[PDB]
Amino acid sequence: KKKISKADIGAPSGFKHVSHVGWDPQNGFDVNNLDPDLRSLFSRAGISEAQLTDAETSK
Amino acid sequence: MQTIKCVVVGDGAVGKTCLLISYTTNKFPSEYVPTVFDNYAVTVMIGGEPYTLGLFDTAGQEDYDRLRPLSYPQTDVFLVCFSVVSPSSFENVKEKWVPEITHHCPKTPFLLVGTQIDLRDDPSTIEKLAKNKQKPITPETAEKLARDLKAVKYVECSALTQKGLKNVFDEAILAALEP
Ligand SMILES: Nc1nc2c(ncn2[C@@H]2O[C@H](COP(=O)(O)OP(=O)(O)CP(=O)(O)O)[C@@H](O)[C@H]2O)c(=O)[nH]1
Numbered sequence: 001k002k003k004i005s006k007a008d009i010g011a012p013s014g015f016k017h018v019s020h021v022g023w024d025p026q027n028g029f030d031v032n033n034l035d036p037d038l039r040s041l042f043s044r045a046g047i048s049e050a051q052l053t054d055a056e057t058s059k
Numbered sequence: 060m061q062t063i064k065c066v067v068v069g070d071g072a073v074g075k076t077c078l079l080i081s082y083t084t085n086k087f088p089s090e091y092v093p094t095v096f097d098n099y100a101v102t103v104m105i106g107g108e109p110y111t112l113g114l115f116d117t118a119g120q121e122d123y124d125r126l127r128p129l130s131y132p133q134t135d136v137f138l139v140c141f142s143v144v145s146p147s148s149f150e151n152v153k154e155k156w157v158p159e160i161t162h163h164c165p166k167t168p169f170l171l172v173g174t175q176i177d178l179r180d181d182p183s184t185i186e187k188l189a190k191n192k193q194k195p196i197t198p199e200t201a202e203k204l205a206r207d208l209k210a211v212k213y214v215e216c217s218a219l220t221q222k223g224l225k226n227v228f229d230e231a232i233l234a235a236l237e238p
């Protein structure tokens with residue numbers, strides 16, 4: 001069975017920053033690790049004011 | 060490798076952001092600017108195995124309605140954090156917070172998170188508004204809603220002190236999942 005019980009889910013331990021979005025009234029969003037699938041939804045949703053160009057790619 | 064889709068839903072100021080952090084970081088933040096989008100993944104011991112908890116933080120606003128639902132598709136349970144020291148949230152909580160979800164998924168589990176304890180334990184404010192227009196919510200009053208909205212369960216939490224903090228998420232996942 002896959003029944004979880006109040007005594008099953010132990011204490012957390014594995015903080016995984018899957019994505020970090022840092023807004024800023026002077027810079028406007030400081031996302032440097034958004035999700036892969038969300039990357040397309042974000043730039044398409046509210047972050048569609050302009051493609052992602054935060055710092056050019058290092059050759 | 061199992062993973063839960065715990066997304067925090069709610070519109071207002073119920074310390075939903077800080078409670079999310081202290082839960083996974085076991086520490087109280089300091090900076091102020093976390094309301095946008097933050098996906099956290101925890102590793103808890105569920106069913107005798109290191110499971111993964113997909114934590115998705117929303118914006119809790121209307122201006123971000125565009126990239127808001129983005130966290131709805133891949134969801135299992137919902138974290139409706141309502142301010143206990145604010146009847147306003149409670150009213151909508153039963154007719155605004157959950158309904159907004161029912162229209163999309165009226166079958167998925169619904170966690171009833173109670174935040175804003177630090178204040179709830181501050182008679183100075185509680186008594187201040189208790190007779191001016193506002194008033195705190197009792198566990199029995201919150202429970203009812205937990206049942207009125209088919210909520211998996213009602214559990215409060217904090218962040219600064221961690222008063223039943225994680226204990227709440229333990230109820231969420233437990234709900235998001237199933238036999
Ligand atoms: N003492 C204490 N302060 C808390 C706790 N949780 C949040 N706060 C404080 O309350 C303030 C607001 O927290 P925040 O989580 O951003 O509130 P919110 O409900 O998310 C508000 P919004 O919907 O605008 O994004 C911050 O100053 C934060 O430090 C807590 O458990 N204890």
Ligand SMILES: [Mg+2]
Nearest residue numbers: 075076094119
């Ligand atoms: Mg917030």
